[PDB]
A paper describes a structure:
Changes in the spike (S) glycoprotein in these variants are under scrutiny because the S protein has a central role in engaging the angiotensin-converting enzyme 2 (ACE2) receptor to mediate cellular entry and is a dominant target of neutralizing antibodies (nAbs) elicited by either vaccination or natural infection. The prefusion SARS-CoV-2 S trimer is composed of S1 and S2 subunits separated by a furin cleavage site. The S1 subunit contains the N-terminal domain (NTD), ACE2 receptor binding domain (RBD), and two subdomains (SD1 and SD2). The RBD transitions between a “closed” (“down”) receptor-inaccessible conformation and an “open” (“up”) conformation that allows binding to the ACE2 receptor.
Three RBD substitutions—Lys417 → Asn (K417N), Glu484 → Lys (E484K), and Asn501 → Tyr (N501Y)—occurred in the B.1.1.28 and the B.1.351 lineages that originated in Brazil and South Africa, respectively. Of these, the E484K mutation is of particular concern because of its location within nAb epitopes, and it has been shown to reduce or eliminate binding to many potent RBD-directed nAbs. Despite no additional RBD mutations, binding to RBD-directed nAbs was further reduced, showing that amino acid changes outside the RBD have an allosteric effect on the binding of RBD-directed Abs. A cryo-EM dataset of a B.1.351 spike revealed a ~6:1 ratio of RBD-up to 3-RBD-down structures. Taken together, these data implicate the K417N-E484K-N501Y substitutions in the RBD disorder observed in the 3-RBD-down states and suggest that the E484K-induced conformational disorder in the RBD tip Hook structure may be the source of the increased RBD-up spike populations due to weakened RBD-to-RBD coupling. In the spike, interprotomer interactions made by the RBD in its up state, and secondary contacts that the bound antibody makes with adjacent RBDs, may play a role in stabilizing antibody binding to the E484K mutant, thereby explaining the retention of high-affinity binding, albeit at lower levels. For the triple mutant and B.1.351 spike structures, the RBD tip disorder presumably reduces the stability of its contact with the adjacent RBD, increasing its up-state propensity. In the B.1.1.7 variant, this occurred by modifications in the interaction between SD1 or SD2 and S2, whereas for variants harboring the K417N/E484K/N501Y RBD triple substitutions, RBD destabilization was mediated by RBD-RBD contacts.
Author numbering:
A (entry chain B): 27 to 66, 81 to 143, 164 to 172, 186 to 242, 263 to 298
B (entry chain A): 299 to 620, 641 to 676, 689 to 744
C (entry chain B): 745 to 811, 813 to 827, 854 to 1140
D (entry chain A): 992 to 1090
E (entry chain C): 745 to 793
Amino acid sequence: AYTNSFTRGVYYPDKVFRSSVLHSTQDLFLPFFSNVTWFHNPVLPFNDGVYFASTEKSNIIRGWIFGTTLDSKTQSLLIVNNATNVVIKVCEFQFCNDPFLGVNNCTFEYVSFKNLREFVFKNIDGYFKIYSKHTPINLVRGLPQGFSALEPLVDLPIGINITRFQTLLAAYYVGYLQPRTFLLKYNENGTITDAVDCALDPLSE
Amino acid sequence: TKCTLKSFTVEKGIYQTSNFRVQPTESIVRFPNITNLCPFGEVFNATRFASVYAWNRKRISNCVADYSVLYNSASFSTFKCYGVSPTKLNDLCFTNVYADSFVIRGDEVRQIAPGQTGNIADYNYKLPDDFTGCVIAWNSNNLDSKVGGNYNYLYRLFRKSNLKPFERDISTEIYQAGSTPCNGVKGFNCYFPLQSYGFQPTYGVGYQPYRVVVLSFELLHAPATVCGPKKSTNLVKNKCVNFNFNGLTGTGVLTESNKKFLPFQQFGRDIADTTDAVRDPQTLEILDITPCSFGGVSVITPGTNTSNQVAVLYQGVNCTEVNVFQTRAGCLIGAEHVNNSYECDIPIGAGICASYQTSQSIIAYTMSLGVENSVAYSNNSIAIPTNFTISVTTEILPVSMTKTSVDCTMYICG
Amino acid sequence: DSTECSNLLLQYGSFCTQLNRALTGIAVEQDKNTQEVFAQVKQIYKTPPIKDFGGFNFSQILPDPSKSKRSFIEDLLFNKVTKFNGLTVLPPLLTDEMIAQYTSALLAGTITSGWTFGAGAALQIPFAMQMAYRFNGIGVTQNVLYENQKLIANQFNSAIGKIQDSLSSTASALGKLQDVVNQNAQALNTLVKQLSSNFGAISSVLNDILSRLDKVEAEVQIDRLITGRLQSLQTYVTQQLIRAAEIRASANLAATKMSECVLGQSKRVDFCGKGYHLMSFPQSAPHGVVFLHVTYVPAQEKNFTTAPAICHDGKAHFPREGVFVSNGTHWFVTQRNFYEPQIITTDNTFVSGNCDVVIGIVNNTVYDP
Amino acid sequence: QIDRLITGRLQSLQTYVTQQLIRAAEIRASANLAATKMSECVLGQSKRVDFCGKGYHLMSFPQSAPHGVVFLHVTYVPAQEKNFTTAPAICHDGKAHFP
Amino acid sequence: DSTECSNLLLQYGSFCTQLNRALTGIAVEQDKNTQEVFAQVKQIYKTPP
Ligand SMILES: *[C@@H]1O[C@H](CO)[C@@H](O)[C@H](O)[C@H]1NC(C)=O
Ligand SMILES: *[C@@H]1O[C@H](CO)[C@@H](O)[C@H](O)[C@H]1NC(C)=O
Ligand SMILES: *[C@@H]1O[C@H](CO)[C@@H](O)[C@H](O)[C@H]1NC(C)=O
Ligand SMILES: *[C@@H]1O[C@H](CO)[C@@H](O)[C@H](O)[C@H]1NC(C)=O
Ligand SMILES: *[C@@H]1O[C@H](CO)[C@@H](O)[C@H](O)[C@H]1NC(C)=O
Ligand SMILES: *[C@@H]1O[C@H](CO)[C@@H](O)[C@H](O)[C@H]1NC(C)=O
Ligand SMILES: *[C@@H]1O[C@H](CO)[C@@H](O)[C@H](O)[C@H]1NC(C)=O
Ligand SMILES: *[C@@H]1O[C@H](CO)[C@@H](O)[C@H](O)[C@H]1NC(C)=O
């Protein structure tokens, strides 16, 4: 099953301040009005990059795992939630379908319906990066029509090969990034505050 | 001006001759506060190093490096470098670094060199002929030796074959020195591979223990995790300066700003993509990099046949930056601000013109548009001419260029 | 500021002087254009204290001394019309206040003295007499002004009011001036953005090449950027030369409309605005000029029966100036641009030969004064 | 080496020919203006203010000059004015007379 | 349309875009000229029988 993404999944493409101005970029982005997959669960492919979002009340989702294998032979990427903060590791665990109860050959380690949180997970070959946003919403399962940009959380200098991912365990959503041009409007205070998916339609073009 | 026009006579006018450009008054650098310094000293101060056949390896990553903190100290019995000179290592970046550490007798330390042959080089730690890195060594007879001998510091005298470059191997087998079938037990012609120096405090220096660390480096397809020092200076505002922020080099006036960068934003840009502000990595400051002051320099002159005097216009410059006169066109220098208005002799800009006049000097003034004349209009008054002049007014128009032709094959090649 | 690039740039010889000369030529020509358009007046004529212009009301187009002392209509024009990487902008020689002194002088001459200030010393004349000469210049007899003077004053004043409303209402009207500003903004911004282009070199940031490469490689990569930036600058300078010739063709047209439509009255049909021309007033505007062309347009016609000539004693009478017309019953002659019937007489008309030769002649009487 | 000298000399010649085309278009505008002043100011009498020199135009004489033409515009300029009282019309018998 | 050249031509920057703007200026002006020459008339007058 599917749902309309409206104008969600925009993110700050570079660490640059700009003010009262329109800037153009081509990068991996979620298209406007795209079909995200509706959920309220299994292993999924990564393609070239992932958008993930959920309407969890109190950071309910326990984490994620990413890699080629997600089972031994090489370190898979592991990410875990502790309240407002995040634990990260890369390890060669080989668990069954309950990895949250399985809880290692590891080579990197780090620590950081009223609400909706949004995340972008991105390999860049110049290592791996994560972007996110947190917002209150109306008490509705479908993604509301609205605008904000996901901000960079971390750069992981890890070099892990990724082709699939899984969630560690309300409504939630998945979509995929595509190489697309976007026009980005910045307000006075450096903030991306409107955008156009350049390829969307002849008026947008 | 004579050299600008390629002539010994300059006719009356104004001529651009050069560009004024404020020089950088000093050089500035900023990078974050010195943090994540690589733990080389924590390896060097470890309580003991291994038996040299199974030398300790520590992987080093995600850190800034200054190897001169190590090699400047004459406290070691030796500090030597191979493939690269010690100073250069402070410039470099690497994906991984390794500290490789062990104990050897004072006579055998010579085997730690590029492409060596002998017990340690072939069977314990093979440095290749193209080894890039450094060797740190010191006497440890006060640390490692014991009465009756210490055996925690063995060396592999025997192995099947020579080790590969930087190879670590824990394999052991009994060496058959003769006809005896050894079959994995000690005996006559059946020597144990891990020989003991048996270190004692009374030993002569060639038998005494030496602790050694060797530094080994790699830069890979996976990008660097180690780099040289985060260089920095004081941060002088409100002067034109050469600068560098986190590797963004330039020259400009570093000015205070109210520009609210988001927490992750490092650099700021204007409409034409040109950089206009930066974060100081050593504070919370966002500084606007106003461009360093510059402009065309033009020389005002009467014709050289009449006088040699000259005056200068610093186009768009403020006279803080350069007889002086600030104008909307720039600084006049060498011309009098006479202010009383006249016909425009030599044009300048924004209503200023200049002339050479009487006791003689160059003067600059707001130009006159001609004499004022209030027409005596009223609802019943007319003026009628009672007489005329015929007049003859010359007008001149060009009609033809000089007819010119070029053979492109003869001009280009010939 | 790279010395390394500066030394390599010498190998291209005169190009980097030649392009700076070509822009200097364009820059000097802008003051030549502005002088040939506005500096046609010999002396700074001034408006009289009492605005006693026979009922006409120039207060919207004359200077407001309380304000740069522009007119009201000049202010609308200055309101509707709407980084330093080695580029420099330069000031115009005449400031916007000096242009407003010339458009004040040209206007105050045109109001108080007709064309005369454009042909010699200015001669004062009452405004309702100046308009009688300008009407007489279009084949409408002087008395058609005087018999309608308040009506003509109200039409002129009302029409000035409609221009003030029109220019106040929309920013889309000044397209010819706004496009000059927009084209130069696009040219300068494109010339700047081309600094960031790689031109097939390793980077467009010169400091990369100056720190990452040895001289023998850095020379090749810099020479790619020089080849790119130099071809960029030559293309911009060539477009500014072509655009300067396009604006010169408009400046010579404006200088010609200043000399003919302001300093005179032009018989060039549809040159100084549509309709028969009476006069025009210049108003200054940023990077340009605005003419308020005042024109007479005939507007409420009647049909008539007409004849090329009329017989009398077998001789044919032609109209001296004007046309023969009839209300079906009686024959009259009129001036041809405004219906005003005159009784046909031997001073209104001239004889030439006999009634045989003229095709389509008619009879009636010609009266003897 | 020859390919660099070709590219340099060729781009330099392209610049000259491009600037000569633009300069020749300015001279054509001047030659058409001269042919217009020849047609009106010499072969006629231009009733166009300040076209055939300042003042009211009478006639003009062309004179040759190297690469151009010189016009000697003969013009009438009024020169010694007197002030007068004036009126647009005058009565004689309740009828109004105009000049 | 051979992609290996297009991936190089992007590195030459604004050139191949501004040439379409320059030719569009020429192309629009051909209509403006033809408008100003012929469309001076206020109505489509037509000749009597
Ligand atoms: C020139 O600079 C000084 C010092 O900043 C300032 O006082 C003055 O107002 C400036 N004048 C102009 C015209 O920029
Ligand atoms: C203007 O210049 C004159 C000399 O030409 C001088 O007497 C006068 O004081 C000056 N006035 C000002 C306001 O500078
Ligand atoms: C008219 O002016 C000329 C000089 O232009 C003078 O010689 C002549 O005497 C004047 N005639 C009258 C009647 O004023
Ligand atoms: C002229 O126009 C002004 C407004 O511009 C108006 O106030 C004034 O009453 C009008 N009439 C006269 C005779 O000034
Ligand atoms: C003039 O006469 C023609 C033919 O009778 C008629 O079509 C036209 O409407 C008339 N126009 C006026 C203004 O009376
Ligand atoms: C005018 O037109 C009609 C039809 O052509 C004709 O009968 C009449 O004789 C013509 N009159 C003249 C003066 O040509
Ligand atoms: C005018 O009147 C004469 C007789 O006096 C007559 O012969 C002639 O045909 C008339 N002409 C016209 C055009 O009606
Ligand atoms: C005309 O009369 C006025 C007022 O008396 C005077 O200002 C003006 O100078 C006179 N002009 C001539 C040519 O006498």
